[PDB]
Design an enzyme around this catalytic site. Structure first.
Site, PDB file in Angstrom:
ATOM      1  CG  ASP B  31      -5.734  -4.508  -6.588  1.00 40.69           C
ATOM      2  OD1 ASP B  31      -6.928  -4.460  -6.205  1.00 40.69           O
ATOM      3  OD2 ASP B  31      -5.024  -5.524  -6.452  1.00 40.69           O
ATOM      4  CD  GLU B 123       0.667  -3.652  -1.063  1.00 45.56           C
ATOM      5  OE1 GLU B 123       1.280  -4.673  -0.687  1.00 45.56           O
ATOM      6  OE2 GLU B 123       0.616  -3.283  -2.257  1.00 45.56           O
ATOM      7  CD  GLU B 132       7.120  -7.876  -3.736  1.00 43.96           C
ATOM      8  OE1 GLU B 132       7.413  -6.686  -3.471  1.00 43.96           O
ATOM      9  OE2 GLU B 132       6.018  -8.219  -4.216  1.00 43.96           O
ATOM     10  CG  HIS B 280      -1.681  -6.377  -7.443  1.00 43.35           C
ATOM     11  ND1 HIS B 280      -2.298  -5.858  -6.319  1.00 43.35           N
ATOM     12  CD2 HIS B 280      -0.353  -6.385  -7.172  1.00 43.35           C
ATOM     13  CE1 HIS B 280      -1.384  -5.574  -5.411  1.00 43.35           C
ATOM     14  NE2 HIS B 280      -0.195  -5.880  -5.904  1.00 43.35           N
TER      15      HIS B 280
HETATM   16  N1  LIG Z   1      13.304  -1.539   2.624  1.00 40.75           N
HETATM   17  C1  LIG Z   1      12.608  -0.626   1.941  1.00 40.75           C
HETATM   18  N2  LIG Z   1      12.799   0.682   2.218  1.00 40.75           N
HETATM   19  C2  LIG Z   1      12.132   1.594   1.505  1.00 40.75           C
HETATM   20  N3  LIG Z   1      11.255   1.408   0.512  1.00 40.75           N
HETATM   21  C3  LIG Z   1      11.080   0.104   0.266  1.00 40.75           C
HETATM   22  C4  LIG Z   1      11.700  -0.951   0.916  1.00 40.75           C
HETATM   23  N4  LIG Z   1      11.258  -2.163   0.414  1.00 40.75           N
HETATM   24  C5  LIG Z   1      10.387  -1.820  -0.504  1.00 40.75           C
HETATM   25  N5  LIG Z   1      10.230  -0.468  -0.649  1.00 40.75           N
HETATM   26  C6  LIG Z   1       9.274   0.198  -1.529  1.00 40.75           C
HETATM   27  O1  LIG Z   1       7.996  -0.144  -1.060  1.00 40.75           O
HETATM   28  C7  LIG Z   1       7.044  -0.069  -2.143  1.00 40.75           C
HETATM   29  C8  LIG Z   1       6.135  -1.278  -2.049  1.00 40.75           C
HETATM   30  S1  LIG Z   1       4.736  -1.097  -3.186  1.00 40.75           S
HETATM   31  C9  LIG Z   1       3.566  -0.067  -2.245  1.00 40.75           C
HETATM   32  C10 LIG Z   1       3.608   1.346  -2.818  1.00 40.75           C
HETATM   33  C11 LIG Z   1       2.554   2.277  -2.207  1.00 40.75           C
HETATM   34  N6  LIG Z   1       2.758   2.410  -0.739  1.00 40.75           N
HETATM   35  C12 LIG Z   1       1.129   1.777  -2.472  1.00 40.75           C
HETATM   36  O2  LIG Z   1       0.514   1.255  -1.502  1.00 40.75           O
HETATM   37  O3  LIG Z   1       0.670   1.934  -3.623  1.00 40.75           O
HETATM   38  C13 LIG Z   1       7.862   0.050  -3.434  1.00 40.75           C
HETATM   39  O4  LIG Z   1       7.720   1.365  -3.959  1.00 40.75           O
HETATM   40  C14 LIG Z   1       9.301  -0.269  -2.984  1.00 40.75           C
HETATM   41  O5  LIG Z   1      10.333   0.423  -3.698  1.00 40.75           O
END
Ligand SMILES: Nc1ncnc2c1ncn2[C@@H]1O[C@H](CSCC[C@H](N)C(=O)O)[C@@H](O)[C@H]1O
Ligand SMILES: Nc1ncnc2c1ncn2[C@@H]1O[C@H](CSCC[C@H](N)C(=O)O)[C@@H](O)[C@H]1O
Ligand SMILES: Nc1ncnc2c1ncn2[C@@H]1O[C@H](CSCC[C@H](N)C(=O)O)[C@@H](O)[C@H]1O
Ligand SMILES: Nc1ncnc2c1ncn2[C@@H]1O[C@H](CSCC[C@H](N)C(=O)O)[C@@H](O)[C@H]1O
Lengths: 341, 343, 343, 343
Positions: B31, B123, B132, B280
C-alpha cells in the site's frame, strides 16, 4: 468428545460461526448442481427412504432432510451444531413437517439419538473432498446406523492428474518475488525470499481450468463410506503412477472429486470434475515450487500424503518423480489456507 | 494481561495467525500511500528521531523500524506478537542493524521493555480507524513513553458523512429475497426472509464509492494519541449534526479516517478519504434500517456509538433523525464481520 | 605499441575484424536504408564541405562512404580498413573508375601511415548503445590527421536514456534463469547456481525495439562532441540522470538509443535510432534492473549510468538508480559486448 | 601442450568464453534427447560404473559426472577448462558429492590426474560430429585410461547422403545478387557478386529437412573411440559411392551423426538423423557449387575430405561425380562459420 479431541477450539468457533450465517447456507443452496443432484439422488431412490428412519449429519438449513421427507421418510433426525439449527427448526414448522423432521442441536459426536437409523445423509465434502474434516463426523455417525443401513453419499472418489499452467506458476512466483527486493524503501527484503516462496506455494489454488492443461489420465482414490472408519482419514496416503500423454512442464497436480449415491433404484453421481458443470467446490491445484519436465510416454510416480490436523484441515505432502530421469519434486501444502483465484 | 482480559482467546489466535503471513505483511507494505506516507513522516521529521530511543508497536516485518533507523534513531525496540517477529529478526540481521534494532517477540501489554522511549511509532489503524482494537495497544504502550515524548501518528480523525446509494440499499433485499419463495426444490423458505434481511444489514460494507453520493460535509471525531488513555476507546460516542448540502434519501453513514504525524519540522497527513487515492482500508458504509428523506438545508442529527467487544472489534450503534421532520432511523452493526463488496 | 593493441585483447580483435571481413555483414549494414541514405544525404547535401577536399574514411568497409565523398567532389579520399574487406573495397574502387580519388589503405587507423593531413573525417563508428565496439576511439584517434580547421562527419553523438516498464520482458528473462532453481534436474540439484544464473541473464542488454508508450519519463540526453573529445574521454563515461516520472508503475529498467548529427556548412543532418523513428539495424537497447522499482507520477528517479571501457572492445555498464522519495534503489551490471538479440 | 599447439589462442579464448556461460550449458542440458540419452546409457549400464573410477572430459556443469555418480561410481574426475569449472564445483558441494566427484579446472591436455580410470565419459560432438575438435581432447584423455577401459560414447558414425533442394540452392544467389546492381546509391557493386556467391557457398547450412529430399542411402564413416588416436582426426577422408534411388538434381551432401554407448549390459544409441527427433545439432548440408543431374540407378562417387585447422574446426573439401556422365562438382567449405538457417 471425539470432535473436541481432534479440534482446536479456535478453529471450531470460526467454523461453526461461518455456517451460522444464512448467507453461507444460501450460497450452498444456490449451487444448483449440488442441491439438484442431492435432490435427484434422494427422490430417484425414494424406496431407500420410504417409511425409514434417517439421520442428516449437519443439516444446515434442513434442505436434505426436506428431501428425505419428500421421499417418504418416517422420521428424520437432523443434527446441526451451528446456530443454523434454530433456523432449520423455523422451516420445519413453517413447512408443517414437525411430524417427520426432528432437529437435534449439537455436534453429531456429542448428541443422543433415540434410535438407530436406516440411512445417513450428509453433505460433508470440502475442497479436495477432505477439507473441513467433516467426513470424519459423517463416518462417526455410523454408530447410529443399523447393520446393513445405507450412506448417502456412499462412496467418494478423489481424482488427481498432472497439469501444465505456466501462467499460474508465474502468477504465484511473481507475488513471492516481492520478497526478492534488495531495496524496498531502502530495506533489503531478500533474506526472506525463501520463506515467501514456501508460503505462497503452500497455498492450494481453488478455481477452474480448461481440461486441455491435464497431461495424463487421472488417478482415482476411493473412500467407501459404508466401510471406512473415521480413523482411516487421519492419514491418507495416495500413491500415483501417471502415464504422460503429452510432453512438457508439469507444474503440479490437479484434484477433484466425485461422490456416488448408490441407491436401490439407481446410482447417482455428483461430480466436481473440470469436464462437468462448475460447482462451488471448483477444482483444486497444488503447485510444485519447480516444475518437472516429462515427455509423452514417461511415467510420473509418487505419493500424495494427507495428514489431518487440529484446525479441521490437512497438511498435504506431494512427492513426484519422473521415473525415467529421476527428476523429483516434493512439496508441502496447507489446505486450510487456499488461494481463491 | 490487559490484552488477554479484553480479548477472547479464539479471536486472538485468528488475529495473530493472520499477521503471521508474509502475504498479509506484503499487502500492507505494498500500500504505497500508507508505507510511503509513514516513511515521509519519519524522514521529514528526522530531528524527532536522530539519536533517539524509539518503540515500534507491532512492527510486523519491521518496516517502520527501518524507517526510524533511516532517520538516525539510536535504539529501536520493535515489538511483535505474531510469528512475524522471527522474520523481522531475520531482516534486522540481514540489513546489519542488530546494533540499532531489537526485536521483542510478544504482546506490548506483556513484554518487558528496559527503558523509557522518546517516541512511539505504530500502524494500529483498522477499518473505520478502530477495528482490531490495536489503537488500545498503541495507547497502552505509553507506559514506556517519556513525559516529553511523542506519538507517530499523533492524532487520528474518524470522518462520518451521510450518503445516498439506492442500489446498495436495494441489494440487501435482492439477496435476502432468495428466501422469499414457496417452493425452493419443494421447500417454503419464506419464514427466514426477515432473518436474512437482518443479517445483511448488520454487516458494515467495505468498498469505495464516488464522492458524489455524499450528501453533507463529514463530521470529524478526533483522538489525540498524546493525550488519550486506552480506556477512552472502549466506548466511543460520536454525536453528529450534518448540514445537508443535497436533497434526497439518506441510506446510511460513510466512514473513513485520517491520521496526522505532528513532528518538530512538519505535520504529515495520511488520509483514507474517498477524495484521496484508494488504500487497503477502502472506506466503510453502514446502512440505516430505513432511509431518511432530507432536504438541502435540513439537519441530520444523532449519534454513532462504538462499543468495544472482546472479539477485537466494535458493535456500532447508529441513531439518526431529520430535525426538521422528526423522521428517525437506526441500525446496530457488527464491525468484526464486514461485507467486502469491492470489485 | 599501437594505441589499438594496447587497449584490445588479441582474441577480441581477431573475432571483430573477421566479422567485418564478411560481405554478408557489409551487405547487412549497406541495406539499412535509413543509415546508408542518411549518410549519403549528409554528405551530398553538404557537398561544399567535400568539394576539392582531402577526406579520411575511418573503417571504410565496402567503401560506400568514400564513394559518397567522391560523389560530393572530394579531391582525395583515404579509405582505411583493417579487415580483409579492404581488398573488396579496392575491387569496387577500380570497377567504379575511382582509382584517382579513392585510396584504400589496409590496416588499423591507429597503425597506418597517411600521406597528408585531411580536411574532414567521415566514419560510421557507432555500435549498440552508441559506444559498443569502441570504434568511436578509433574515430577520435584519427584526429591526429585532421587539420586544425577540420570537420568530423558525424560531428556529435547524443545518447538518450529513459526509464521503461515491460513486465513481459522482465518475466521472459527471469523465466530463463529459473532453470537454475531446479532442485532435481534429472536428479541433480541446480539451485545453488540460481543467483549466478540471474546475474548472468540480467547482465545482457536487450537489443530490440518497443512501443514508445512503455517509456515512463522524458529522456535524459548525454552528448559527445567528436570535434572536441579525446580518445581518453571514452574510457570512462559517466551519465548522471534525474527523471521526472510521468506515469506511475514499475520501472523495469532503462532504455537507450542514440542520434548523431552531421553539422555541415550547408545544413545539419540527423541520423536517429530513436523508438519514434524508423527502425535501424541498431534497434534500441534496454538494460533491465534485476528487481524493478515502483514509482508514482511526480516522483524523481535519479542515478548514474557508468560505462567502463574493457579490453574486449566494449564496456562494463553499471547502472544505479533510486526513487528519491522512497530510497528504493537498484544497482545493476551489464556486459554490453554480449547482448540478447530479441528482435 | 597438445591443445595449445593445435589451437590459435584467439579461437581458444572465444571457445572457452562461450562455454563459460550458464545459458550455453543450459542450452545443452535442456536438449532432452542428448541429456536423457546420456543418462540412460550410463544408468542402464550401471555395471560399467558401479565402484569404478571415471574421467569426465569437459564436464561443463558437471551433469554427466552426476549421472556417473547416480550409477554408483567410486570416483569421478571432472575436467573443465572454462570458468564453468567454478560452477560445477559449487554443484558438487551442494549435492553432497565432494567425496566422489573431483573437479579439475584446466584443459585435459594440461591437467594432471592422480590415477588411471576405468572409463571415460564425454560429450565432445560438434556439428557434423567433428566441429570444435573436441573429439581430439576426448581421444587425448586415453592416456589416463586403463587397458581394461571403456569410452562412453564408444563409437561415432558420421552419415552423408546426397540431397535435392532447389530453393536452398537458389537462395544463395538471391542473397548474393544484392551485389549485382549498377547503382546502389550511385555505386556499381557488381564486381563483388562472385565473391559474395563464393562466401555464401562456403558456409555449411545448419538446419533440418524433410527426409524425402534425400536421393540415396547414406554412406557411413565410423570413428572407434577405443581404437582411434588424436592424429587420426587431423585428416578425415570419406570416400563415397551413392547408388541413386531417385532421379533429379543433386544440390549437395547432407550430414548427420550417431554415437553409440557400447556397455556391458546394452548398447545405447544417440542419433541426430533427420528421421529422429531434433537435437541442438540439427543436421548439416554442404552445397555443391553446381548441381549434378543423376538418374535413379546412376552412381555418384567422390570424396569428402575434412582437414583440421587451428580454429578448432575443419576445412571441408567435397568432390563428386556422376559416374555414368562424368559430370563433376566440388565445393570448399569452412565448418567454423556455418549458416544457421533453422526457423
Ligand atoms: N498487542 C500487540 N502486541 C504486539 N504486536 C501486536 C499487537 N497487536 C497487534 N500486533 C501486531 O501489529 C501489526 C499490525 S500491522 C503493521 C505492521 C507494520 N508495522 C507495518 O506498518 O507494515 C501486526 O503484525 C500484529 O501482529
Ligand atoms: N460435527 C458436526 N456435527 C453437527 N453439525 C456439523 C458438524 N460438522 C459440521 N456440521 C454442520 O454441517 C453443515 C455442513 S454444510 C451442508 C448443509 C446442508 N446439509 C446442505 O446440504 O445444504 C454445516 O451447517 C455445519 O455447521
Ligand atoms: N581501428 C580500425 N581501423 C580500421 N578499420 C576499422 C577499425 N575499427 C573498425 N574498423 C572497420 O570499420 C568498419 C565499421 S562498419 C562501417 C563500414 C562502412 N564505413 C559503412 O558505413 O558501411 C568495419 O569494416 C571495421 O572492420
Ligand atoms: N580440452 C578441453 N579440456 C577441458 N574441457 C574442455 C576441453 N575442450 C572442451 N572442454 C569443455 O567441454 C565442454 C563441452 S560441452 C559438454 C558439457 C557437459 N559435459 C554436458 O554434457 O552438458 C565445455 O564446457 C568445454 O569448455
Amino acid at each position: 468428545s471425539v470432535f473436541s479431541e481432534r479440534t482446536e477450539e479456535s478453529s471450531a468457533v470460526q467454523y461453526f460461526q461461518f455456517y451460522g450465517y444464512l448467507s453461507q447456507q444460501q450460497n450452498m443452496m444456490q449451487d444448483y448442481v449440488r442441491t439438484g443432484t442431492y435432490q435427484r439422488a434422494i427422490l430417484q431412490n425414494h424406496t431407500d427412504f420410504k417409511d425409514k428412519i434417517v439421520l442428516d449429519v449437519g443439516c444446515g438449513s434442513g434442505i436434505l432432510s426436506f428431501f428425505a421427507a419428500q421421499a417418504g421418510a418416517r422420521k428424520i433426525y437432523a443434527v446441526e451444531a451451528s446456530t443454523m439449527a434454530q433456523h432449520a427448526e423455523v422451516l420445519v414448522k413453517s413447512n408443517n413437517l414437525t411430524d417427520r423432521i426432528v432437529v437435534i442441536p449439537g455436534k453429531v459426536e456429542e448428541v443422543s439419538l433415540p434410535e438407530q437409523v436406516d440411512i445417513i445423509i450428509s453433505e460433508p465434502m470440502g475442497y479436495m473432498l477432505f477439507n473441513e474434516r467433516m467426513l470424519e463426523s459423517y463416518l462417526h455417525a455410523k454408530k447410529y446406523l443399523k447393520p446393513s443401513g445405507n450412506m448417502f453419499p456412499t462412496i467418494g472418489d478423489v481424482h488427481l492428474a498432472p497439469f501444465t499452467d505456466e501462467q499460474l506458476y508465474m502468477e504465484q512466483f511473481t507475488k513471492a518475488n516481492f520478497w526478492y527486493q534488495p531495496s524496498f524503501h531502502g530495506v533489503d527484503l531478500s533474506a526472506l525470499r525463501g520463506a515467501a516462496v514456501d508460503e505462497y506455494f503452500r497455498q492450494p489454488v481453488v478455481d477452474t481450468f480448461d481440461i486441455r492443461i491435464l497431461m495424463a489420465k487421472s488417478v482415482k482414490y476411493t473412500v467407501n463410506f459404508l466401510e471406512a472408519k473415521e480413523g482411516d482419514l487421519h492419514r491418507i496416503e495416495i500413491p500415483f503412477k501417471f502415464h504422460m500423454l503429452h510432453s512438457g512442464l508439469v507444474h503440479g497436480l490437479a484434484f477433484w472429486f466425485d461422490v456416488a449415491f448408490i441407491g436401490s433404484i439407481m446410482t447417482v453421481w455428483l461430480s466436481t470434475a473440470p469436464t462437468e458443470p462448475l460447482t462451488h467446490w471448483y477444482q483444486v491445484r497444488c503447485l510444485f515450487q519447480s516444475p518437472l519436465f516429462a515427455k509423452a510416454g514417461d511415467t510420473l510416480s509418487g505419493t500424495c500424503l494427507l495428514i489431518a490436523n487440529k484446525r479441521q484441515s490437512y497438511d498435504i505432502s506431494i512427492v513426484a518423480q519422473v521415473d525415467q530421469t529421476g527428476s523429483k519434486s516434493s512439496n508441502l501444502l496447507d489446505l486450510k489456507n487456499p488461494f481463491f483465484r
